[PDB]
Paper text:
Human bestrophin1 (hBest1) is a Ca2+-activated Cl− channel essential for Cl− transport in retinal pigment epithelium (RPE). Although the structure of hBest1 is still unsolved, two Best1 homolog structures, one from bacteria Klebsiella pneumoniae (KpBest) and the other from chicken (cBest1), have been previously reported. Overall, the channel is a pentameric assembly with a single ion-conducting pathway, which varies in diameter along its length and is constrained at two narrow points: a “neck” contributed by three residues (I62/I66/F70 in KpBest and I76/F80/F84 in hBest1/cBest1) on a transmembrane helix, and an “aperture” formed by a single residue (I180 in KpBest1, I205 in hBest1, and V205 in cBest1) on a cytosolic helix. Here, by electrophysiological and structural analyses, we show that the neck and aperture in hBest1 are both indispensable Ca2+-dependent gates, and their dysregulated opening by rationally designed or patient-derived mutations causes Ca2+-independent leak and elevates Ca2+-dependent channel activity.
Alanine substitution mutants for each of the 12 residues were generated in KpBest and hBest1 and subjected to crystallography and patch clamp, respectively. Moreover, the equivalent KpBest mutants (W16A, G18A, S19A, L259A, P262A, G264A, and D269A) all showed an overall similar structure to that of WT KpBest. The corresponding “Ca2+-binding” sites in WT KpBest are occupied by Zn2+, an essential component in the crystallization buffer. Moreover, KpBest L259A, P262A, G264A, and D269A all have relatively low resolution and slightly altered structures in this region, suggesting that the binding of Zn2+ stabilizes the channel structure.
Numbering used by the authors:
A (entry chain E): 24 to 293
B (entry chain A), D (entry chain D): 22 to 289
C (entry chain B): 22 to 291
E (entry chain C): 23 to 291
Write the structure that this text describes.
């Protein structure tokens, strides 16, 4: 980031001394039209940055749903079938594996470490077999439910109550998948990314005729404004991906595991 | 790149502007940058709001197609958990659900669904479906039959029937949504007026920029016009989300992803 | 397009501006561009927000009308799947559902339903409907008794009676949605302040632009007029979306579509 | 219209500016338009956003009332379809539903409900309802009694008791909605700060404009002041949409339509 | 708070008035035109960023709305479905009310053991406190009262679910506030805009001084107030659960919820 700040000082220091030689040549740059170009570029940046934040908000929200759906899915099992702790333990395995599996999915990293830690090596094979493991896990979770229904422990009515929670989970898998694959640029945020770049360097060549030796000091401030806002938006265009923060996605998979363990009394120590 | 016509009609409107600056004061015409800043800022505000509407629309498209994937996934899944016996009923419903996705992509693209419909369904059904003045919506009706019969046959209760019915509702809203998108363009008025005044402005600009820049006019009267046109194209770039080229939604891609996800779920 | 009345009343105002510029420094009226530059930008900002708030009402109007097709489509579908036999009820229900679309088009346009209502229904009904304070609400109450009877008859169970009820809810939300949009104008004075102010700014702008551009004034003032004036009517056409203008919602097309859809092959299904 | 009380202050501020312009160098006060351009623009951006946030509150108000009408009609229609016999329950319920609408109107407007409540309810109820510090919550609670009775009568199944329960939910959210809107004002800073800045900016402006415009200052300076002052009172009017102003919500109108609607549905 | 900032700006104006004498004899110009540009840009960005903070504050205030609505109707469902079972009434209302109070605490990073022991037996208070999310646990315990009523045939699976859903709704509120709290907006939306509005505000006098001479301090302090007000109006609404006076009144909100849930269950506050 700081690289484009200092190509500017160079461009200013150039524009100061090279301001001499088009004295005789008749090619001038006022500030009046660059101020127009700038006020424009800043409107578009403000609108664009706005869409990026909205993209980030949807990711935060989607993940919060994982926590809620999983918490209330486990709560329904305890409230409805308070005895079936072998089932409780199994379903809580699948939910926790889904969180971890999804975080690994959006990050394009390996899930095998977290999966074997959580599920039997038949299942870990069936899940790593599938092209859609996160979906696969939800399918397996759904079996432990539908089985308690064959077994008669769940009625169609109380089966339905829990199924709606696997729905909430399924909309999240799709929800994040769509956020991740979709480039909100369509590589067209590479247009704005560069138009800001051009304007930001042509700026001293228009500012120098007003500010003399001040040109670098003011031409970098305007640049650090315009470049921050752009890169701060390009960041939130990809909120799971490589250009993102992992502390929340990891603290989130950790909280849900902690919450699900505490909810089935595997914590505290006996 | 119908854009790169007025990008270089500009350089030619910058040179008509340079060599005919001389005559200006004698004709009594002056072009100052001050009102073109006013105009351009008012255009740029309007362009900004208008792009926003267009992006919201593209998003809404990407979203609806996203829901086909969710609703059909969970619908297969519900069928597995609730009737794990009935793989006859599984492969039937899965083929309608796959057919729906493909029949919708065609309809939105105005292409012929008969190929895929026959790959996926018995000729009886392909006939039934294509008879309809609304075949995608019909495919849904046929999928709901397999569900309904299963209920008639006692295998689904009213409750579990309801659980799967709501998945056909989600799909039924995806159809209405795409139909509405493919037929309600952002009023031709919004797109015609803006596209007009952005053009008129971008070509009167070098006449007003010349007093301040002398020969520097093209290298800047273009850089300004690219910014105001790139932004008006990018809005027309996303007003056809169901097209078959460039930035338009990869409906063919998505349709496969659906078919693969859905066979993966049923061991095929 | 009474816009072109004033697009030219402005040319006659640019003209008054030019044949009074050479009594200027005599009458002592210094008049510059930079405060009208402020006035323009302030108006554009408020025109930008106002026009966006209009498109939203239009968008919402369009969406509600979409919901009619969806709710009515799957309402038919549920009858064809749950009571596939009862085609005498199928037709009774479809008849009402299409009365709804036409009736609501009339309600929102303030035209006489009686034509359409008779084309579609028995006359004992056409009277009872036209008898009612809210007719569209009454059509909806008749569609309910159709469902309600089938439930009493025992053909529909409580569950599957409920499944269809929700769809009449979906439609009662579309009713109130369009009343709210129609009977609620954009709060008053929003139009008077924002429409008074843009005319006035359009006809004073040449008086202060003439000093800078000289003759170019009618060209540049009419340009700025077409920009600020088309945008103010564009926002006004959208305020009323159930209107009869060409930019309004095509409600007769939409009701036809609904009708062709619910009678795909004369209400006949696979 | 204390805007016109404010607008004339500006025109006397303008004559003041004109007469006291000459002694400017004699005092050393240079005032250009350019920094007021920056400032005034910034005010417009903030006003734009601020005003926008208000129209939201107003719209949300409107929609909550919109749902009262929807929720109460379908609650009535569900009774006329599930229990077309039991008219004793229809009267008791429609009376309770229409009481709710009126109890809420009076609640939001801070007015005595006892007129409309007595007019629609028995006296053992009206005393116990006004007894409550939450009378509209109480009406809803009594409205659920009738439903729950019918279910314990066996005239409603749990399933059809369910279907109607969900409209009481719908109405219970409308309560909370309006209650939240009325108590929660937009942070008492958005309307306070911006009214200061607009007011003060309007006053100083002719002192920056007069150097340029001279005797013209009153005209240009009172125009610019009108634009800003008007766009600022719009957002003030919407701050409380449940008031009595001509530009607030017609709640008396709204509540009669609800009472005619539910009465025409019951043949009364 | 920002009243020192205004003052420091005056000093910077006064510094700039005295220091204008050495200007071109030190090699500098400063036009107003470039700062109108940068200044407008900052206003646009502040305009959007402010808009995002109002949204968080609206949603915080909104989620707390749903706490009341959900609990009021979970109570109404009990009364109307099981009017007899008034022991279930009191016990459920005690967890629902304790849920509110613990959520207030959770958000505020303060200790609920007081409010908890007021409301619930100690077997519960210890059980609740052992949890890494006591509000979750409280929901679990209010879930059993509903659940055991279903095992005793007093609630069918249908009417159980009716009330279960309100429990689900509350769980959404909980996850929602937890999400509004643990996620601040990208912290860059502060260091960027706070630096930039500050830096712009203390150099504006240096550039206005040519145009306005002595007039520089007033105009410069007006423009600085307008930018600095609109800046911090977004900082307040960034922790809407905090204890600042503009933050949400969670204690009043929490009482209205108790008052509401008692007024429904015969007992009088
Ligand atoms: Cl366990
Ligand atoms: Cl357990
Ligand atoms: Cl199969
Ligand atoms: Cl009656
Ligand atoms: Cl609720
Ligand atoms: Cl009746
Ligand atoms: Zn949920
Ligand atoms: Zn357990
Ligand atoms: Zn733990
Ligand atoms: Zn779903
Ligand atoms: Zn199978
Ligand atoms: Zn295309
Ligand atoms: Zn639907
Ligand atoms: Zn039929
Ligand atoms: Zn409803
Ligand atoms: Zn001239
Ligand atoms: Zn002339
Ligand atoms: Zn009746
Ligand atoms: Zn009687
Ligand atoms: Zn009284
Ligand atoms: Zn609720
Ligand atoms: Zn009780």
């Amino acid at each position: 980031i700081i690289f484009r700040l200092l190509l500017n000082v160079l461009m200013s220091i150039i524009a100061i001394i090279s301001y001499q030689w088009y004295e005789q040549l008749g090619i001038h740059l006022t500030v009046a039209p660059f101020s127009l170009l700038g006020i424009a570029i800043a409107i578009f940046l403000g609108f664009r940055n706005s869409a990026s934040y909205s993209r980030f908000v949807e990711a935060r929200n989607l993940w919060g749903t994982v926590l809620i759906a999983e918490r209330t899915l486990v709560r329904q099992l305890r409230n409805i079938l308070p005895a079936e702790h072998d089932a409780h333990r199994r379903i809580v395995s699948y939910l926790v594996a889904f969180s971890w599996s999804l975080k690994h999915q959006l990050r394009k990293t390996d899930p095998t470490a977290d999966l074997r830690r959580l599920l039997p090596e038949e299942r870990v094979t069936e899940i790593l077999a599938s092209s859609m493991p996160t979906n696969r896990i939800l399918l397996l979770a759904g079996n432990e439910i539908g089985q308690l229904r064959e077994a008669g422990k769940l009625s169609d009515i109380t089966y339905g109550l829990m199924d709606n929670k696997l729905d909430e989970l399924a909309h999240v898998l799709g929800g994040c998948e769509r956020l991740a694959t979709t480039p909100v640029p369509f590589a067209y945020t590479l247009i704005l990314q560069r138009t800001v770049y051009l304007f930001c360097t042509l700026l001293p060549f228009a500012l120098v005729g007003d500010l003399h030796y001040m040109t670098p000091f003011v031409s970098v401030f305007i640049s650090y404004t315009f470049l921050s806002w752009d890169s701060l938006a390009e960041e939130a265009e990809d909120p799971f991906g490589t250009a993102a923060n992992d502390l929340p996605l990891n603290a989130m998979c950790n909280t849900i595991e902690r919450n699900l363990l505490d909810m089935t009394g595997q914590h505290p120590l006996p």
